């Protein structure tokens, strides 16, 4: 199910070429859950994302 969630903290540039951004995300519908995600594109604090599969939390070193 489509679930929407807001960016609180961008954790940094990840990926081999720096193509992705690791970011800290909290949900609006339940503003208690917190997840870590990888995004493509320019992200600043306050961006709200639409997640198709909001179960797994992404990871890169």
């Amino acid at each position: 199910p489509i679930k929407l969630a807001r960016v609180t903290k961008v954790l940094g540039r990840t990926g081999s070429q720096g193509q992705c951004t690791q970011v800290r995300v909290e949900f609006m519908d339940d503003t208690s859950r917190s997840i870590i995600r990888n995004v493509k594109g320019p992200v600043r604090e306050g961006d709200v994302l639409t997640l198709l599969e909001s179960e797994r939390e992404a990871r890169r070193l």
Binding site: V10, L11, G12, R13, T14, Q22, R59, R60, L61
Partner: peptide, 25 residues
């Protein structure tokens, strides 16, 4: 510490890098 090495090994370095790129009268 071991906790610091594990957390810093599973996180990403962020911040420091500077790129030098690029009236009245």
């Amino acid at each position: 510490p071991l906790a610091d090495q594990i957390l810093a090994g599973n996180a990403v370095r962020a911040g420091v890098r500077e790129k030098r790129r690029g009236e009245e009268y």
